[PDB]
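Exercise: predict the structure of this protein bound to magnesium ion.
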Amino acid sequence: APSRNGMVLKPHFHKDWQRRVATWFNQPARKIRRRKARQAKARRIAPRPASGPIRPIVRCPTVRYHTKVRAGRGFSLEELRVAGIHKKVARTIGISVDPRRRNKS
Amino acid sequence: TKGTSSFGKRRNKTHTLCRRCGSKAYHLQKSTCGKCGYPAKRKRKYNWSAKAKRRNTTGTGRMRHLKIVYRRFRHGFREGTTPKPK
Amino acid sequence: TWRRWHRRVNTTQKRYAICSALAASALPALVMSKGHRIEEVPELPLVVEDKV
Amino acid sequence: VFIVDVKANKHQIKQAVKKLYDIDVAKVNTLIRPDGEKKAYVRLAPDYDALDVANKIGII
Amino acid sequence: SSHKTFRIKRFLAKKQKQNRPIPQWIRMKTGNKIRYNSKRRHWRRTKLGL
Amino acid sequence: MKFNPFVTSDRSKNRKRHFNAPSHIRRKIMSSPLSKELRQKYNVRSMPIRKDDEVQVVRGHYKGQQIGKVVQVYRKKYVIYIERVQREKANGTTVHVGIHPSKVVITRLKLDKDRKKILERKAKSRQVGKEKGK
Amino acid sequence: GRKRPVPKGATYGKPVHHGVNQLKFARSLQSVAEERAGRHCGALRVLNSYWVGEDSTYKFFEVILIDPFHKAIRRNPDTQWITKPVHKHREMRGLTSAGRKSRGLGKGHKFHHTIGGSRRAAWRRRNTLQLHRYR
Amino acid sequence: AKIKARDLRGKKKEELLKQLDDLKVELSQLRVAKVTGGAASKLSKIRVVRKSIARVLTVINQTQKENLRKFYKGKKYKPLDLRPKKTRAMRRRLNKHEENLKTKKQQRKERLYPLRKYAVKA
RNA sequence: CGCGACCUCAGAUCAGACGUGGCGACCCGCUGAAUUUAAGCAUAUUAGUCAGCGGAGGAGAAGAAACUAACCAGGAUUCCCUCAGUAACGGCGAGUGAACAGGGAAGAGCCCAGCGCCGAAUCCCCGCCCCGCGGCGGGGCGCGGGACAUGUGGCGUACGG
RNA sequence: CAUCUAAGGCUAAAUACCGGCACGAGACCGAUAGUCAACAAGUACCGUAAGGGAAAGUUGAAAAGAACUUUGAAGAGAGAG
RNA sequence: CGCCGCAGGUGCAGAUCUUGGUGGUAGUAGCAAAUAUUCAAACGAGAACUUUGAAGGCCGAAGUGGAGAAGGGUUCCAUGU
RNA sequence: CGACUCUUAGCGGUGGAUCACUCGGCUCGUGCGUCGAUGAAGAACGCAGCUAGCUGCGAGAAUUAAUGUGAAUUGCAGGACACAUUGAUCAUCGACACUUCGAACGCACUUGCGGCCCCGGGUUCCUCCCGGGGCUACGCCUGUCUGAGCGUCGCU
Ligand SMILES: [Mg+2]
Ligand SMILES: [Mg+2]
Ligand SMILES: [Mg+2]
Ligand SMILES: [Mg+2]
Ligand SMILES: [Mg+2]
Ligand SMILES: [Mg+2]
Ligand SMILES: [Mg+2]
Ligand SMILES: [Mg+2]
Ligand SMILES: [Mg+2]
Ligand SMILES: [Mg+2]
Ligand SMILES: [Mg+2]
Ligand SMILES: [Mg+2]
Ligand SMILES: [Mg+2]
Ligand SMILES: [Mg+2]
Ligand SMILES: [Mg+2]
Ligand SMILES: [Mg+2]
Ligand SMILES: [Mg+2]
Ligand SMILES: [Mg+2]
Ligand SMILES: [Mg+2]
Ligand SMILES: [Mg+2]
Ligand SMILES: [Mg+2]
Ligand SMILES: [Mg+2]
Ligand SMILES: [Mg+2]
Ligand SMILES: [Mg+2]
Ligand SMILES: [Mg+2]
Ligand SMILES: [Mg+2]
Ligand SMILES: [Mg+2]
Ligand SMILES: [Mg+2]
Ligand SMILES: [Mg+2]
Ligand SMILES: [Mg+2]
Ligand SMILES: [Mg+2]
Ligand SMILES: [Mg+2]
Ligand SMILES: [Mg+2]
Ligand SMILES: [Zn+2]
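Solution:
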């Protein structure tokens, strides 16, 4: 029952939520595991860059973020063509390539 | 008389031992175990009785093959080889 | 198991507490009141050479 | 009187007794005891003395 | 009854053979903790499953 | 202190391992110190107790300088019976009193091929330890 | 369609569940045909199937099966995938084309029910309460 | 007095079976002594003779099995008990040859564009 | 009025293989309530949940756009934070309720059919010889069988070839 | 106008894991508690069956577990140790 | 165990509360369906009850008799306590 | 004076609270992540000198071999065991073995009854009896053999 002034609250706890609760006590263990895997991968690709292939410069899509620039999935085929790198050779020297991205400008 | 008098007339067994699962639930007239469902290929098991499931799950018995499997797993299931003779 | 065992403290608060503990570790009355037998210690901010 | 394997029939018991005691037997009667062991009464042929055979076996 | 099957007779034989007291030398073993056979079954008190 | 993450420091686990140890490591658990003369002769300190070696009790009611040969190594009860470590019971018969091997010192070792091999292995490990810590 | 298999049409409950006729099975008849072929030949792997005819009361499909242990399949790459254990009874887990069509999988705004790989996976992710260590 | 497995392996089948028969008649006599009272020595000899029978039979069976293995060595079809028994699933999987063989297109790709070892300056 | 070829079928304790049943915490496909809440109750809620059935693996499923967007555009899947208790749904009542963009963990791409060209170039099995055994492969020979033109293999797949 | 190219197929990683094998730990419980079960516990026992399902830890450092005498038929006592 | 902090499965007379134990009742109700016992002896520490003998009775062949089915499962038979 | 009753205290009973103990749980985390027709899980019956349960094992039955170890096991007994012409015990476990039901597989079971092929015995080769061994389930793929069709054809 409502009691004086308050906020009309709608808790989403009508659906046996106690059977599906995700605790996070394995979060520090997961951080350790991922860190160890990163170290092992960096050791495995011994002189190659640890983070991976070089990603392209990409502008964020919508009107909220288009003033910002981030890393893309891969270099376009037109980019590789006018840079003079074969699309099947780039992935061996560590250039990521996105065959489905076009260049509008 | 539904009570003591009628208890005197029970002398024909409904169930006998079951060749699978060894329980005294093999309905003779239906020719079917009411615990494991023996003539059926698959064991009778229901999730509404976790207690009954854990009474007869794997591990409640002997595990003749599975114990050896668990031991053999630790060495990659090696075969055809023997320790180097002394 | 979901009792909220952990608490998060502001970084500024935690740095504040470190600064307070360090400042209090240089006052002989407070160290003696923690009961640390600093009676023949030549200097309470006791600093030794790097070879240690 | 012998205690025999519960899976052995009268022919097997007769042949086993004949071979491992060098005697000839007339008939074998067989029961299974309330404890589960099979018991065989092996009557010997008229020209064999079960007393002497039991003495050689060592069960007198 | 007098008429019984081989499986029934063998089951009864096993239940007969395990209905006996513990050997007295058992209680002299190191760390025994056993006093008397608690699985004793009398024919008149407790009836068999079959 | 202990840093190995695969060896436990749990009291219950340690006690369970100790009391359910198989006899071939109950042999390790039932080790005794050597006397000072033996510890100087061989470069070893401890030694698993053996059926036919002679010891001195150093703790308890039967302690003293008397040398007594071991007559039994009762590994199930973690005790050893020695020659004169005994008492009269009610009817007048004499029964051995078992004592822990950690409370004796081995004065003479029952020496055979295996004992000599164990002694030299222990001495060699101790010597490599000393030359590592030199 | 799929008549609800209840005795005398009695579906004891609220009126919204009183339906018996005009009910439909979630999977298609082609998927059912593939499942029957696979269940009969559990020693083979259902690859795909196609429509070969229909009647007022029957539909006819032909189901392609592969013997995973034949040497012509084992020794040929690009068909060795079907021999792996993760591919036994695809038609009973809806991994064929006909079976997959009923799961609502796809890309884009029409298929948000199955983000995560399946409807049940999406449901679990959306209905799990993430109770972090620091709240 | 006891028999060992290491000095049984030099002997042939006939004398191994003769040894087995002697041990069996000895065990039967020991059981007779068990039921006719007997003595503690004869009662304790039962286990020794039983283990000796087991030892002789183990040597016989091992010799026969190793002879069968050397006879079926190199043959296309072997009896199931002579085949390895890793795990049912591990017997169902591809062997090494068909596990690692590749298509002509795959190996042509691998030849044309092999993975390169490289480093990137900062 | 028999002998053959093919097609479609059958039998075999034929030669060699394969499936079944269990476990089922996690995963995939179905089926699927009512208690409960709504201060009654029928739509709604519980809940696509419990129970029921089937199928797997060490993970599974998903997955390289018949996508998102509307921007100066992004770019497979999966997971986390956030979007967001929001847009929306709802006896618009009780209640329910995502996605895109953004930041991260990880990051990897590809193969057929078809259209074509290449004397079926292709594959399985059985023999015999050699090298081997450790899961049975390589090489060689066969006027040795079979599969296959009602289409095997090589090139090639929307990024064009 | 933009965007993709359906109705064929494969694919690791990050992700899940109240069953299993083997470990480590705890501001947890301490024998009416904590698992039903610290113990010959899914046992004894109950029900035709589906199924239901306990109670029950502690001599002492060491058995050194009371020899022997005595009353009583013994249980049980008095001395002694 | 005290003090300074921290954290709770933190305080019992009640719940026809849960489990365990124990009272008064109380040496009480009761050990009353189907006619019935008695004498002597033996064994034995001990005899209304066991055994033998003698007597008086009952079941009265649709039996309180002699044998089976089902069910029980060693209860059967000796010896001993 | 006594009995009886009540209160309190000493002692003794009945009872098993309290406290101390803990080879047990519960919770979290990690690494692996492995069953089965070559017969699983499960069940039954057996197996020890004295052994009922628990545990272990399978007619080689509280275990064989092998390797490591290195003098015990133990409640009692017994006998081992030069510890080097090799060894108690334990651990490990890669060799061998692994009864009957059970997906359970010749047919069937609250019982029982077959068929085929070899081997041995009574026979004294011919097929009856006994014993031993190996086969004999369903579905399905590839191939093989034997076939069927007033299916489509060729030749005569
Ligand atoms: Mg990254
Ligand atoms: Mg009634
Ligand atoms: Mg009936
Ligand atoms: Mg008979
Ligand atoms: Mg009764
Ligand atoms: Mg190709
Ligand atoms: Mg065949
Ligand atoms: Mg299955
Ligand atoms: Mg309501
Ligand atoms: Mg209400
Ligand atoms: Mg109502
Ligand atoms: Mg409704
Ligand atoms: Mg369910
Ligand atoms: Mg997959
Ligand atoms: Mg997929
Ligand atoms: Mg594409
Ligand atoms: Mg907000
Ligand atoms: Mg909903
Ligand atoms: Mg082609
Ligand atoms: Mg408890
Ligand atoms: Mg207590
Ligand atoms: Mg008494
Ligand atoms: Mg409380
Ligand atoms: Mg109270
Ligand atoms: Mg109150
Ligand atoms: Mg009265
Ligand atoms: Mg009266
Ligand atoms: Mg009369
Ligand atoms: Mg009568
Ligand atoms: Mg008192
Ligand atoms: Mg050995
Ligand atoms: Mg019949
Ligand atoms: Mg024709
Ligand atoms: Zn059953």
